[PDB]
């Protein structure tokens, strides 16, 4: 993982039981079975702004880099699409990519980026993260924890 004891930057992160305070919606009703949550994705949606999750809460200092430690594979294998900055306003993010390959590995992948624009929780604009995973291409989706960090030492 990343430094000692990884630096959660938000108290939650455990989509085995509920999916906390996150959002999910827009494909098929998420299920946490055993201990995960997949959503059925096969369908044949050429649009990602259509099925994923969301949450806010994600500061971001302009300057430093932060990391995205998801838990989740993809079923067949393929890519997909994630976002994450504010939600008001500028709406213009950071976080914004489209090339985040995923396939029969299931484990934690660290999405490190720059941060270009500060993102404060008071401003009528607070955290904000959407995983685009909808996709005429996409497929299954299986999350059982999701958490961002920045590792520091």
């Not at 959660?8 to 201990?35: K, M, R």
């Not at 994705?41 to 050429?46: D, H, I, N, T």
Request: charged content about 15%; some cysteine; proline content about 8%.
């Amino acid at each position: 993982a990343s430094l000692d004891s990884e630096v959660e930057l938000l108290p939650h992160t455990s989509f085995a039981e509920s999916l906390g305070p996150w959002s999910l919606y827009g494909t098929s009703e998420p299920v946490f079975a055993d201990g995960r949550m997949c959503v059925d994705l096969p369908g044949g949606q050429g649009n990602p702004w259509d099925a994923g999750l969301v949450y806010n809460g994600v500061p971001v200092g302009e300057g430093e880099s932060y990391v995205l430690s998801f838990t989740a594979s993809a079923t067949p294998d393929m890519p997909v699409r994630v976002l994450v900055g504010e939600g008001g306003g500028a709406y213009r993010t950071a976080f914004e990519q489209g090339s985040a390959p995923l396939t029969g590995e299931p484990a934690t992948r660290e999405y490190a980026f720059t941060s270009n624009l500060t993102f404060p929780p008071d401003g009528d604009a607070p955290g904000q993260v959407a995983f685009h995973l909808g996709k005429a291409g996409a497929y299954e989706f299986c999350i059982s924890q999701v958490s961002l960090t920045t590792s520091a030492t």
